[PDB]
Amino acid sequence: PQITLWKRPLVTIRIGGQLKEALLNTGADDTVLEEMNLPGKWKPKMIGGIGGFIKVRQYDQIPVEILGHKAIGTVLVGPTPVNIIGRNLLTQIGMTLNFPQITLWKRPLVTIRIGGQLKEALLNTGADDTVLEEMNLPGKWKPKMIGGIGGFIKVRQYDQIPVEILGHKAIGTVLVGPTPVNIIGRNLLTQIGMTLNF
């Protein structure tokens, strides 16, 4: 099947007798769930994103069911604002990004062109918006706040900015601020005709 990116790519996942809505997240290395008391050994781990780090528990070898597919791997548990299916499990169920085909064993980093500049950015189905590391862009910007795994940040919102992504042209909203990596979000992914497929 093919999942478009017009809205958040949410799917039901099953873990034991517990069913959860979770975000299919190409911008996450790891799979991170809210509230649950899985059996067995775990270790503490710190995971980071847009507004800092959170502490989680790492459970290994946990079988999940995603979209009728059987997966088994590491599941992190902690105070994530949304449940997140990461690349560790996305690869096992055969999920790719497609327009050419990008598999998810590595971070889906591509080269983008913005204002004559070449930068590396992450194709992120788990991002509503496109957020770039601090840079100068032209035009009147609007102050804005956004959130991620570790909380909220101030960003600057530029509208109708041209961005060439893997040679595909988009023109849309680009937020600039203290993101850990450049992030191409769904607003631009839809513009270049990207989908999740499995």
Partner: peptide, 7 residues
């Protein structure tokens, strides 16, 4: 307005 991505 939410941007997950976990390191």
């Amino acid at each position: 307005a939410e941007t997950f991505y976990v390191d």
